């Protein structure tokens, strides 16, 4: 349940639950992004570094901020 | 369907931005970046003014229309 | 003899160009396509940070915009 | 002689004459602060957007205030 | 750091990366490119992804644990 | 004598060779006729990727060239 111990499969389901983020979810899994790597992600990482369109990148970034409970 | 902007599709955002003065090219960019209504509401002032390759003028207008959209 | 909110991009250029020492930076407003609407949406932080504008003109521009809004 | 009609060079000499403000005078000149822009400076402006150390920023503020004062 | 990272051998670095979660396999690439403790500290965030063809997941955690290692 | 910009191909080799784990790479530098002039023209891309050289020694060579450029 705690995101810090989430696995790559867990993070996949997380991103795949987001609207229109079901394709990047696979790219999140392909790059072996577990719960730790997910929390290490910065806003710049998403777009320019991970080749992700701003739309999905915004929603993913926002959902991550929700896990950290603001 | 529903009138709320939070469930706007990628197309709805385009039509919203494309209808704005001098923002007809920017809408195409918005559409290309798959910016739907949910993402449109997540945009920050820094995102428009600086982040992406958008002229400040239209960026100021788009920003202001999103702010007014939230009430 | 015209309300600033309906000022075109060129109307704004001539406005900024008329300001002291702001003749060169007036082209940047036009380059950024700042019409009368986008002109009135500009904040003090927007001038230098978002548009590279030197602090000199930025102070004079911001001041004259406030007088334009009549404060 | 009147601050309002001072040029960028006149402002440079003014700041340069202040103790330990020599290098900052160069920044003023680079940022094209004329007499008008100099009088438009707020206390916050000195070290918020201009990145002046508090020390010389205090002296500059003080001399600008002495300018607006007796005059 | 009883063993200063600067004098870490190529094999000392392999064991370091191997101890990181999910970086057990990627550790072998650090050993392959002959990255000692000296090179490990010269690495930058961009170096991980592009230069060594490292997956982003491990690369993020490797980058983070190095920054925590440098706090000494 | 020993001045980086005027180094010969041999001077570079002896320089690269003295570095830990960069012994075989020094021989590659020889074969590519890299004198001190060409050594100072090398970029990070040239070391890491552009040629088959292990990143470890490539990083250390980069750093030592960077330290060599500080005066």
């Amino acid at each position: 349940t705690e995101p810090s111990i989430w696995t790559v499969d867990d993070v996949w389901a997380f991103i795949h639950s987001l609207p229109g983020c079901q394709d990047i979810a696979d790219e999140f899994r392909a790059q072996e992004i577990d719960g730790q790597a997910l929390l290490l992600l910065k806003e710049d990482h998403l777009m320019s570094a991970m080749n992700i369109k701003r739309g999905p990148a915004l929603k993913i970034c926002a959902r991550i901020n929700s896990l950290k409970e603001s």
Side-chain angles (χ1 to χ4, degrees), chain A residues 19-65:
Chain A
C21 295
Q22 287 124 74
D23 248 30
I24 163 63
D26 303 343
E27 184 62 22
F28 257 71
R29 181 168 60 190
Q31 296 298 318
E32 303 184 357
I33 298 182
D34 49 8
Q36 290 219 271
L38 179 70
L39 297 181
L40 290 180
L41 283 167
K42 302 173 184 175
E43 192 163 16
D44 197 87
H45 277 136
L46 298 177
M47 262 244 53
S48 68
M50 292 178 62
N51 233 332
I52 303 313
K53 308 187 178 183
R54 193 73 274 220
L58 272 164
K59 289 173 287 187
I60 296 184
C61 184
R63 246 291 177 177
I64 296 171
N65 286 2

